[PDB]
């Protein structure tokens, strides 16, 4: 409830300020007188998406450290990070990071 009130207050204040800034100069009358589609941008977007997915996999590490299976958890975390590094390396060597 408190966070909902905070978000509503923030949005309301921002909207009110924007509209008053937009309408204060509007009271006074005045004169009132493609193809390229670069592939590199799409490639960097896709790379960001995939690395974001791997980061999502990596996120629960702070709570994963208390399991009594420290060897298995450590092996799995290092496996995930090694796969992330290997994906980056494959993208690097095959000229996937060129402008």
């Amino acid at each position: 409830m408190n966070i909902m009130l905070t978000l509503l207050t923030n949005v309301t204040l921002a909207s009110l300020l924007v509209l008053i800034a937009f309408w204060l100069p509007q009271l006074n009358a005045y004169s009132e007188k493609r193809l390229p589609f670069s592939m590199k941008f799409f490639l960097v977007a896709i790379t960001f998406l995939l690395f974001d997915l791997e980061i999502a996999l990596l996120l629960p590490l702070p709570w994963a450290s208390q399991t009594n299976n420290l060897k298995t958890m450590l092996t799995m975390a290092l496996f995930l990070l090694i796969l992330l590094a290997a994906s980056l390396a494959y993208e690097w060597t095959q000229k996937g990071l060129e402008w």
Binding site: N2, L17, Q66, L88
Partner: protein, 303 residues
């Protein structure tokens, strides 16, 4: 007495980002062997008021041919995110105490690029669209490293709670435990907020400017809390508040100093810098920080 707290957290932030422009002009002027604004008011103190009044009384240059919907939506989202990204912060007691505060900050920072995307799309120009695309790509690329560094550092904290960061650094700053991660985090915050050397690019313009400067102050306060902890005495929080504010101001002055003291990167140069210098080191240091508590039997408590 909750709305009072929200207003007392919102209005001072806006005043701070109002006077940050004056402080930045003065600092750059004195670094460039001149004086900043010192005619309007005693020492330029009335300059932000004059700038705001001039901006709000100037006619807006609405394209009259674009999508007015997204054109008016984008500043709303930018300012709303900039203001709502302050509530988890403990100084020293957060306004809203959340278990997963850091993830909330990361999520809002990730959402921040929608304003850039929509402003570029609604600008109705191919050049503006290209600029927006470059800005979006840079922001997301650097936010990847932001997230990785954040989780790697929090591995020594115990959880995602922001308040616990005060307890972790009670005896020693986190700057000494991991300085390389801190330096890469500082550069990532510089590049995320579009600041030199990474700044390739009436009403809504002022809206965007306030959002950007509020993001600057937020990022610097977050870095101060995360890496430069202050002693917290429960019976007198004013000491912690003073220390935290001083560290935030020092980091902001460092931001202005860095802007004034360096040339700017190219787009491809900064993309290369990230993808080929920060990300490999970030992965290596994340592995090191995963393995370190198990090596030294110093796993943080909370779970």
């Amino acid at each position: 007495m909750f709305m009072i707290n929200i207003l007392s957290l919102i209005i001072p932030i806006l005043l701070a980002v109002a006077f940050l422009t004056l402080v930045e002009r003065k600092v750059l002027g004195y670094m460039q062997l001149r004086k900043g604004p010192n005619v309007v008011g005693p020492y330029g103190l009335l300059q932000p008021i004059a700038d705001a009044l001039k901006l709000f009384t100037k006619e807006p240059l609405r394209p009259a041919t674009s999508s007015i919907s997204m054109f008016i939506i984008a500043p709303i989202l930018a300012l709303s995110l900039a203001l709502t990204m302050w509530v988890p912060l403990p100084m020293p007691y957060p306004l809203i105490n959340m278990n997963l505060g850091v993830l909330f900050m990361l999520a809002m920072s990730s959402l921040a690029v929608y304003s850039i995307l929509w402003s570029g799309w609604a600008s109705n120009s191919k050049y503006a669209l290209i600029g927006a695309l470059r800005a979006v790509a840079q922001t997301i690329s650097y936010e990847v490293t932001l997230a990785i560094i954040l989780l790697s550092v929090l591995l020594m904290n115990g959880s995602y709670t922001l308040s616990t960061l005060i307890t972790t650094q009670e005896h020693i700053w986190m700057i000494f435990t991991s300085w390389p991660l801190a330096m890469m985090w500082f550069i990532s915050t510089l590049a995320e907020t579009n600041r030199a050397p990474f700044d390739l690019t009436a009403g809504p313009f002022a809206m965007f400017f306030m959002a950007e400067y509020a993001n600057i102050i937020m990022m610097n306060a977050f870095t101060a809390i995360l890496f430069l902890g202050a002693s917290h005495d429960p019976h007198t929080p004013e000491l912690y508040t003073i220390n935290f504010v001083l560290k935030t101001l020092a980091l902001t002055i460092t931001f202005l100093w860095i802007r004034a003291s360096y040339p700017r990167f190219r787009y491809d140069q900064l993309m290369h810098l990230l993808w080929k210098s920060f990300l490999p080191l970030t992965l290596a240091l994340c592995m090191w920080h995963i393995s370190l508590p198990i090596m030294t039997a110093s796993i943080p408590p909370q779970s």
